């Protein structure tokens, strides 16, 4: 387990605006099979190495890949406040998981 992940940290954002979620896995040459993006316990999106990006039907109208190797979550609501996760699925290293916290203001 030589790798680590740098995230967007802890960010605040205004209600009704956009936000960018980003993670970077450094310190390993491992295969990255798939990244799962979660809002708390709910699946937001997956980026699969072979088959690309797929957006959950619960977020298609406001979640878009990019910029970079992350997501843009639009039309923010106060209930979007909370934890966010970027779960890296790797070979042979295993499963690294990064955390972001987002607070939606007013």
């Amino acid at each position, epitope marked *: 387990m030589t790798g680590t992940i740098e995230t967007t940290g802890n960010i605040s954002a205004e209600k009704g605006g956009s936000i960018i979620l980003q993670c970077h896995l450094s310190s390993t040459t491992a295969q990255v099979t*798939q990244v*799962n993006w979660e809002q708390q316990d*709910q*699946l937001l999106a*997956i980026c699969n190495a072979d088959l690309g990006w*797929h*957006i959950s039907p*619960s977020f*298609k109208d406001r979640v878009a890949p990019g910029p970079g190797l992350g997501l843009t979550l639009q039309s923010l609501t106060v209930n979007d406040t909370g934890e966010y996760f970027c779960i890296y699925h790797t070979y042979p290293d295993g499963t690294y998981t990064g955390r972001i916290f987002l607070e939606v203001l007013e």
Partner: antibody, heavy 126, light 114 residues
Framework: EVQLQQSGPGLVKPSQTLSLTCAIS??????????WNWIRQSPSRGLEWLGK?????????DYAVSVKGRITINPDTSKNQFSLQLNSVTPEDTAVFYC????????????????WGQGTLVTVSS | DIVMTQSPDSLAVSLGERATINCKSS????????????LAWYQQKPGQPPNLLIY???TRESGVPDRFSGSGSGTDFTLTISSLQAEDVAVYYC?????????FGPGTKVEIKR
């Protein structure tokens, strides 16, 4: 084709729990390219989606707001099935309940319902 | 939620004639990235579950006779039966699988005029 075989009692007393199982043949409940759904149909409300469970390196679920708090859909990997539990039923829950496979082969998180169970008529009555 | 409507509520067509039915979604279900329309059509006969006929708005499911076809824009859809057969009497539903919760139209009943 996939076969979906439903079982479970149809008659449920008001305020008690409905429990149905869908046994899968010809696919795996953990398949990366499917999601396992429950639908209900009644003369009053037509066809309505209730919930789904699916595995994308990890088990996920989604439930309709009209049953949130009362509904659980759990996979059983050893028996290759998935179940429905609906708590605190009222006569509004009387309907035909269907399990179905959602085929998510091109969009990994969305697709049509390509195979269906035979349906279980559920009657909420004392 | 997305609301699906259908028209007409019922139709009666002579044996061998063309039957067409309409569906509308209250928002677009065309996803620009893959250019797919997230729309399905089902057939349901009495006592049976719905049976998938068309998905991606215009792709016919395998085993479905080729007299069944679909087309549409991002919001308005049509299911056409080119030559109505006696065994085609049933209720036909459309359904979006674009956003949660997935939702169904109210159904159009298709009958034979004789």
């Amino acid at each position: 084709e996939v076969q979906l075989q439903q079982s479970g009692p149809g008659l449920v007393k008001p305020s008690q729990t409905l429990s149905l199982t869908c046994a899968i043949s010809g696919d795996s409940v953990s398949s990366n390219s499917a999601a396992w759904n429950w639908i209900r149909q009644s003369p009053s409300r037509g066809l309505e989606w209730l919930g789904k469970t699916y595995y994308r390196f990890k088990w996920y679920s989604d439930y309709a707001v009209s049953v949130k708090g009362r509904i659980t859909i759990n996979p059983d990997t050893s028996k290759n099935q998935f179940s429905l539990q609906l708590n605190s039923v009222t006569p509004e829950d009387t309907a035909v309940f269907y399990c179905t496979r959602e085929s998510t082969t091109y969009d990994l998180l969305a697709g049509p319902f390509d195979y269906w169970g035979q349906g279980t008529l559920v009657t909420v009555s004392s | 939620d997305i609301v699906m409507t259908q028209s007409p509520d019922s139709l009666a067509v002579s044996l061998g004639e063309r039957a067409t039915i309409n569906c509308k979604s209250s928002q677009t279900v065309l996803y620009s990235s893959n250019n797919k329309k997230y729309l399905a059509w089902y057939q349901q006969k009495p006592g049976q579950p719905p049976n998938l006929l068309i998905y991606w708005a215009s792709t016919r499911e395998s085993g479905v006779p080729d007299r069944f076809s679909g087309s549409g824009s991002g919001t308005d859809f049509t299911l056409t039966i080119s030559s109505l057969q006696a065994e085609d009497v049933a209720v036909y539903y459309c359904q979006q699988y674009y956003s949660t919760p997935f939702t169904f139209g109210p159904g159009t009943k298709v009958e034979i005029k004789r």
